[PDB]
Amino acid sequence: HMAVVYAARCKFGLVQNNRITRAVCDLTNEHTTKDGSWHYVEVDNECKYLAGDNPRDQPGWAVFVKYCTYYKGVPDA
Amino acid sequence: GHMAVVYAARCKFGNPLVQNNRITRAVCDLTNEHTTKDGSWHYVEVDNECKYLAGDNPRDQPGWAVFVKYCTYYKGVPD
Ligand SMILES: [Zn+2]
Ligand SMILES: [Zn+2]
Numbered sequence: 703h704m705a706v707v708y709a710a711r712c713k714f715g716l717v718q719n720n721r722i723t724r725a726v727c728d729l730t731n732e733h734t735t736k737d738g739s740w741h742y743v744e745v746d747n748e749c750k751y752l753a754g755d756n757p758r759d760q761p762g763w764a765v766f767v768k769y770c771t772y773y774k775g776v777p778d779a
Numbered sequence: 780g781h782m783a784v785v786y787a788a789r790c791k792f793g794n795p796l797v798q799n800n801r802i803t804r805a806v807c808d809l810t811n812e813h814t815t816k817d818g819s820w821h822y823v824e825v826d827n828e829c830k831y832l833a834g835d836n837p838r839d840q841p842g843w844a845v846f847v848k849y850c851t852y853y854k855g856v857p858d
Contacts, residue, residue: 776856
């Protein structure tokens with residue numbers, strides 16, 4: 703059922719801010735069930751999450767959006 | 780009964796971020812269509828509110844996730 707990798711980005715300026723994106727990724731990981739999603743990977747600077755054909759159907763998407771917009775970022779799925 | 784609080788679900792745009800009434804109404808309608816009917820997700824013209832009926836943890840519920848899906852697909856900021 704969740705066989706697609708997506709990168710959630712928290713953008714400013716609009717380009718990803720790696721520090722805010724990592725923080726949001728970590729906060730999302732801690733505030734969602736542990737399913738493999740919401741692990742920030744340094745090599746390609748991606749907050750990776752796992753989903754189906756629509757990334758925004760993942761339950762963590764709204765959590766990511768809450769933290770990203772709290773810090774005045776624009777979330778991109 | 781068990782969902783006794785009214786929340787306004789907003790999809791915001793601009794600087795400063797303010798509700799866009801048309802996108803909010805569209806998202807409210809799409810959310811209504813894609814959730815089970817429980818009284819939520821009716822857009823009220825007199826106060827320009829997409830009214831969401833919930834309890835104490837409105838943002839943990841499945842309907843809010845659907846609102847968030849549509850709002851962010853159109854590049855809004857939900858609440
Ligand atoms: Zn800040
Ligand atoms: Zn658009």
